[model samples]
Target chain A: GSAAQRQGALAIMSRVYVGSIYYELGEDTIRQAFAPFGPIKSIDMSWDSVTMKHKGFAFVEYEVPEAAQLALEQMNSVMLGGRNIKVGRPSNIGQAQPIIDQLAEEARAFNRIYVASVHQDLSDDDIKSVFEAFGKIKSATLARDPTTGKHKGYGFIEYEKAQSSQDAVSSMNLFDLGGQYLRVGKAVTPPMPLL
Target chain B: GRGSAAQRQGALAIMSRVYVGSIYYELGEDTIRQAFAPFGPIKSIDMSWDSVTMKHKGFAFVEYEVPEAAQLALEQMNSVMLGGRNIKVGRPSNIGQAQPIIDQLAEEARAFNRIYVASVHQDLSDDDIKSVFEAFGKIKSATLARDPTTGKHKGYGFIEYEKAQSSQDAVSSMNLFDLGGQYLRVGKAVTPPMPLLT
Candidate 1:
């Protein structure tokens, strides 16, 4: 779904609320637990440092709608290790929304620019040269790790005019670069200060 | 000619086994027969009971004249509500030996380097969890057990790390905490093996 337009089809974000599951158990257990319902694209579970264990929940991305729906029905109340499971779709967008919004807003300002895929080797200068073909660029920067100075697999380009940015997004988004499709969009607001 | 005809008709089939956990005994034999009759011709119905209490054994074995009927019944009625509870339907386990199954599970645990972390707080969310544990190494997976009836946090979760060193790191780092004036207990999860040989 496109958050910038707000009219795209809604994508289901499923979150599993587990209780008291051990962190050391095999991931196959979770896969088997959810497999009866659908095909999962990816599953991630975070743990705690103080306790050095699982927080007892996971986020699963499903490939098909039916699989997600079936999982919601059967596994929602099933018991695992003397505890019942809670399954539901996440209500809000995930943590990456703020960063995505900022990128979208920046796109509206720049017209012609390069949209590069996440590459560990590509530098900021490489990105600037690619976009400079259309017109003079005001600025070029790659989003990178604050500490490591490596590409965050994403960056922003500001063209002299807004039209160039739109043209780049239209032509370069999903364009093949370094064997990966690029996700191009305008920048939004910056992240709010962490509390 | 007779054997070929039977083969052409799809006569030989795999017999599906019904397990105790997935059966219901609340309904009468007549109702059970009626419910399962649509699958195929009934070969026999075996219903067991408790020796002292004289109560239903919570399961039954239904033999069908055709293998297709048995499979059809399993597919259609495994989750179908009968009398009240949804029953599970599956092929029967091998009655010959249990040692292989136990050995297999043990071998799997060894290969995967399975570790079980226990005594987790119920209120913690998954993200709050990743903030603490992701640094040990690449985590394989994590989960929390919950109560089925109320859907509340069950106060303990599990995490599986990609490496045994990561698991050990997690165990040493956070073993205790005082939350809400309660001291929490944290340790490696001890998994008891089933006594299949006996």
Candidate 2:
């Protein structure tokens, strides 16, 4: 069926891929949070089939590109609904690439420090334990193999402020985190070019 | 493809400058040079301006001493945020934008063939200067500063060349070049007529 003539569609939109969401996070709340930036075209959330459980992610589209960038800057790393959410560009969203792309731009202005060249035996706890002495770590996550469930060599440590991140490096930059001298620094968001 | 036809024609004379974009209007050329110089010795930073508003075009061309340094900066700094913006750093060829801006940066990079060198380590011979600058292009002349009476090097010199491209290439890469441990300042020579009434 042909859709009604849509003339006022957004020419340039920013599709923001929102992550680290809590179950209580409401779609209506997200709409209100982004309202100050600019007009939001729509918001979508993935839910667990049958269970109807909210999948901790969302896709938000803005009417204008600048509006999306505004959301990206104002909302990224910002605490919302008691949980800090990540605001970034959509990487892969099955069937809706074109519209989702309009909602988000690439990642910049990072807060997470990627500590690479670490031993693979450490879990999320060991990762957090090493970085906690510097200051309160927002979150420390270790990369694990999907199939084997083994620890990946590198991991990420997120801090609320840039200062706490630098503090970690000053205290135990090269201290052995179990096997090797750790290389700790701001996490490098692999440059995934918008193809 | 290299760039537009005019840019490629311009490239025939020189080849190590990078096209920098997504820059904030407030950031000046000096700030850009400071951000890029650590990767490799920089030659020049020329920023473009918008035609309609005649404001900062948020684009610039940074020439490096060699392609190696430009290549390294591209690898490390591409998509790197600068001044609260996601700066898109790429080669001139990678740029796909208004043809006018591309040609404008290319046209602005035209060369000159005279160099002013400072911090000359005093021990360096004239031949040394010739050899260093000669690597870029044929030199018309090179003059090491000399004391009028004692005839010793004054730690400065001026070199003239046949082509502006060669001089720019030589001066850009060789400025702040360490020679015998001293960081020399090499740049376009200022040629002013000696005060009259001789």
Chain A alone, TM-score per model: 0.44, 0.42
TM-scores across all candidates? 0.30, 0.29
Worst window of 10 by summed lDDT in candidate 1 chain B: B189-198
Candidate fnat values, all: 0.00, 0.00
Stretches of candidate 1 exceeding 4 Å from the true structure: A1-27, A32-65, A68-195, B1-21, B95-198
Candidate 2 lDDT tens digits, A56-110: 8798986434455446644654557665565665544333433333222222344
User: Interface root-mean-square deviation for each candidate?
Assistant: 16.0, 14.5
Query: Which number leads on TM-score?
Result: 1
Name the docking class for model 2.
incorrect
Tens-digit lDDT string for candidate 1 (A1-195):
235322111233223333334455545777767754434568877678999767877767654333444455445535565444445444344554444344445434435243434456777887678666655778877755579877655555777776466455545655666676554544332221111
